[PDB]
Design a protein around this ligand. Sequence first.
Ligand SMILES: CCCCCN1[C@H](CO)[C@@H](O)[C@@H](O)[C@@H]1CC(=O)NC
Length: 681
Amino acid sequence: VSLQPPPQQLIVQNKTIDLPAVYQLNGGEEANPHAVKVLKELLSGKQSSKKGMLISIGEKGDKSVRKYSRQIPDHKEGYYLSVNEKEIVLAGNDERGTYYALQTFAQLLKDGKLPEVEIKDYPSVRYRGVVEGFYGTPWSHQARLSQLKFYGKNKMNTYIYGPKDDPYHSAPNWRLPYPDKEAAQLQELVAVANENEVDFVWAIHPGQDIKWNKEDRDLLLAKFEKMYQLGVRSFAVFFDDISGEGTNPQKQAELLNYIDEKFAQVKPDINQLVMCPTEYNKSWSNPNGNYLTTLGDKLNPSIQIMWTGDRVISDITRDGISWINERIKRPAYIWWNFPVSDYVRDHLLLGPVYGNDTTIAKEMSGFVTNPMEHAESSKIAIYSVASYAWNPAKYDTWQTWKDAIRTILPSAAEELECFAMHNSDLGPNGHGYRREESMDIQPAAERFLKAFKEGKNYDKADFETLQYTFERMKESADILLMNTENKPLIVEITPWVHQFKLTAEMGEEVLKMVEGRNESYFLRKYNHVKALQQQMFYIDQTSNQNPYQPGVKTATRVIKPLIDRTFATVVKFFNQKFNAHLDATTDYMPHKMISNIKNLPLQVKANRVLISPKWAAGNSVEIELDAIYPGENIQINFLEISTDGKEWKTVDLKLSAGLQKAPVKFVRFTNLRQFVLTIEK
Ligand SMILES: CCCCCN1[C@H](CO)[C@@H](O)[C@@H](O)[C@@H]1CC(=O)NC
């Protein structure tokens, strides 16, 4: 088996022992009852009695396992697991340890058969898990219930609740208790987290409008107190992405220490207390100021401080963690902003987890991932982060990705792999963060395109690889659409699956245009491609219509540019050959734009028509829409309207011109970061 996470020490013998038909259970009444419940499910159908094979379960100190005390590792959440033909031992250093032994035990089980094996295990990082900390639609209740079962299975002990658009988490209603319905749901979440050995850390994000007074201090404590009554035993205060007084390091420290002394140390049973600083990565840290060393010196040392790395989106390196730890005077609690896609919402990020140093476990208090608003889809990265964080020294990126996918979707693992490996890069974005994509076919794609562009003979093998890949892509899309094993996963990814299928069909038809040996056939494929472009645009305009990066982009890094440039090239070649004037545009645009900028394409985004973001006065620009619409405004960062081209009407900027529902078809500007017409849909 590929045990995930991989244990710290494992010795296996070529000898299997059947899951005994007859077992004596020793320590079921004293061991972690969440661990016992898991064992008893694994043993349904088998007989209990005082005869037959002994199964020893308990926490170090319990009589059930005092026998094995010096084999039980002396770490938080550590365990000893042993299988031989005589007996089974499942012995945690603590209750969570025992639960974790059962999670490893369940993976060892196959057909009703166990390998003869000896395991001593424990996590290299103390706090491991997920921070629901993104902008966008927060995870549904059902998605959260499923997350927490998944965290228990992969030994993640931490779930930090902090969805930026939950109004009771953030400003201004952080001051209000949750309504009954949500409160009842959070209470269930906390109970379920408890059953899966996950710390539910409730975060609050009061900083944008906090006053540094008695009144807001008390409301914050009253809100924590409410959460505590709901079952919450860990807490966080986040000061990220704010301006104003709330950024004050002295005051933040004083408030966290107050929470610490008057609440966290006064209750009998509060576990983590965590804060997110305002300077939460090195690039936003101001060496002109003293923000981080002030937190470092003033914040009670048991309080965690979160950190995203050298940048808002970054991977964690030795130099980076060393840089921060020196300032905050404790090991940073890593907030890793992957696979969060809230700033590239038209991309799914389903690639492997990589780039984080595997030797620096001792330098971090915790490691949590900030995932996508697509909960199930995020499990690929989550499963992987759990593997990494439990045993970084043995972290195998690619094998963990595969095991993740095979866990999440066993009936269609190879199809999900196919889809995921072409849906991993983020594309260009303000943070500069990129991931690999489509790496297996990138060299064949690069050689083919350079040869074809230059009139040299492409390698046949390269052409067949591209063919194979498009074929595989369609099979994967089609199978994934109908898969019923993980319906919520398929709901999340479906718009991208449709777009991926179309991408593959377009690719096939373009390769037929390359090989095409007569005019007529070439023309049929050309027209087919144009129709597929238009379908891609339709999906782009009707799926995933969020306000920030609407639409659906897929296979962007390698596959789409290859198809686009191949199509442009072969149409150029066809035009030269047949003295024809076929249009070589690669993305369908129903509206037109002319200028003297010329080839900055237009884009449609919701009810906006914009020029893709050059200060020469060549003289004019005109946009023609495909119909008459009521106009809202025109926005510009470094002007007339018409319905027919002939009668015009000047509008005055400010830069922003209101149109006041004036019918618009044409827009002209005479005498660029932004140039956007908003119309009424
Ligand atoms: C300019 C605002 C950037 C927001 C930065 N990150 C994420 C970007 O994915 C986003 O999920 C947001 O919640 C988070 C804030 C943050 O990084 N806190 C440690």
